[PDB]
């Protein structure tokens, strides 16, 4: 396959004068306005493919649960005896800005879940805990205690792995429509007060974590990190990149009295 050889020109045919009002970006090249020599590309543009761009694992969520005596706990959920997470890709901003370069996106997900334990206060040892991660689709009973009938999970996919290890599985594209909406300028119905922008069109399920082990004498903090990798990516309609900071999952809102995002010159327009 990058530049052809081109020499002096004295024509009536001027490729460099255009009318940008038309909305086109005319494909002008170095050889339209200087004299060039042949050179080859030596490159394919492999690593800019959208499959590659969205295809590496990104941290999408960090939560935490603890193993401790539940005796007398009136609210397991509240003691972090167990914890749920409604899956999202817009809570930690790194991956979010990448996805929102597109309007609709379609892909399978590969999840990796790393779990590490901490024992912040005096323990004789490090126990070996098994985590259970249950995939709870909308309409399933939700766990109420850390050892409910729910955890039987007879119809709901669940993975059991050890703290310190990693669990990995992949979920097909679960969207209800043909693509996930990265943006949605609508409502769920014509209600006067219904929420704007947040939609089920994006919904990817939800996940509940708990330790299977009963309690030892000390307490053990287990912190869960969920990583997400898109595989089989398809993206439509590019948009302007995100400039201001994010404030909320699912709305476009930016913070008030934000700071100028364009760097001011130290000098003139004329400055180098």
């Amino acid at each position: 396959t990058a530049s052809i050889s081109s020499g002096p020109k004295h024509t009536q045919k001027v490729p460099i004068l255009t009318a940008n009002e038309t909305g086109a970006t005319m494909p002008v090249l170095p050889s339209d306005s200087i004299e060039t020599r042949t050179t080859y590309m030596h490159f394919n543009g492999s690593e800019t493919d959208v499959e590659c761009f969205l295809g590496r694992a990104a941290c999408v969520h960090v939560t935490e649960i603890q193993n401790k005596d539940a005796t007398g706990i009136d609210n397991h959920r509240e003691a972090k005896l167990f914890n749920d997470w409604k899956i999202n890709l817009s809570s930690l901003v790194q991956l979010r800005k990448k996805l929102e370069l597109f309007t609709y996106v379609r892909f399978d997900s590969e999840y990796t879940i790393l779990a590490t334990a901490s024992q912040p206060d005096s323990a004789n040892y490090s126990s070996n805990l098994v985590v259970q991660a249950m995939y709870v689709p909308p309409g399933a009973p939700n766990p109420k205690e850390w050892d409910d009938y729910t955890w039987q999970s007879a119809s709901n996919p669940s993975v059991f792995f050890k703290v310190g290890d990693t669990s990995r599985f992949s979920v097909p594209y679960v969207g209800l429509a043909s693509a996930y909406n990265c943006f949605y300028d609508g409502y769920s119905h014509d209600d006067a007060e219904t929420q704007y922008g947040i939609t089920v069109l994006a919904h990817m399920g939800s996940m509940a974590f708990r330790i299977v082990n009963e309690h030892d004498e000390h307490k053990t903090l287990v912190k869960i990190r969920v990583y997400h990798r898109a595989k089989h990516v398809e993206a439509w309609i590019p948009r302007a990149p995100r400039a201001l900071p994010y404030t909320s999952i699912g709305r476009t809102n930016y913070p008030k009295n934000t700071e100028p995002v364009i760097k001011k010159r130290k000098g003139d327009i004329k400055s180098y």
Binding site: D185, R242, L244
Partner: protein
Amino acid sequence: GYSDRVQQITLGNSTITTQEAANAVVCYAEWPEYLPDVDASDVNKTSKPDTSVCRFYTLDSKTWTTGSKGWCWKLPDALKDMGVFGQNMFFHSLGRSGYTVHVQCNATKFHSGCLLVVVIPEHQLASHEGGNVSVKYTFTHPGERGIDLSSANEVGGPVKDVLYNMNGTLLGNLLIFPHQFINLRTNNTATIVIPYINSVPIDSMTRHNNVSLMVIPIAPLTVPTGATPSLPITVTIAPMCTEFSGIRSKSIVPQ
């Protein structure tokens, strides 16, 4: 003697002529078309009013003055009240449509000024409150009036800050969306053909707008000496290939 410059668009019972065009944009290089069976889901036969809905509606005019910040209309909202297009809209459960948008602004060879005319698929607005405040329905359904970016923040309304496109992105990059400029010195109209763009084959016309049309002054209007300091901008829009499905009782929407 054909120029890129003169054009005629006849759609239904209405025709537009421009003698100072700058080509026309067809979003994503695709022209509006009906919904193919292979893509269909709802089993209902659809209704295609054709020429009674696919004609040109001219919205009320705006006034560009030296202080203007820009205006924003949503589709199909802007047309919610135009003739039979609008009736069909409130009466069917689902509908689908593409449009021809023609924005008009003429001046003289002594004026200067340049407007950006852009179509943004799925333009989800931001609340000026920040945090996770929502933007109420009425605020994103201004109707033919559209939203005036130089109007004041209101409560439950969107933010109207132009350098941020009403969503946290910079004005400068709106050029990645199908768009055309109106530069008084060149141009006097902008025309964009919009194919139907959605993640579902057909949708509700009232709970979801699928494009915002935005006209934004970028190089300020500058009139000749002792000229009146303003020009009107007119927007005429025509639904094209419209289909409605799931007819019934007639939606009632807030406000």
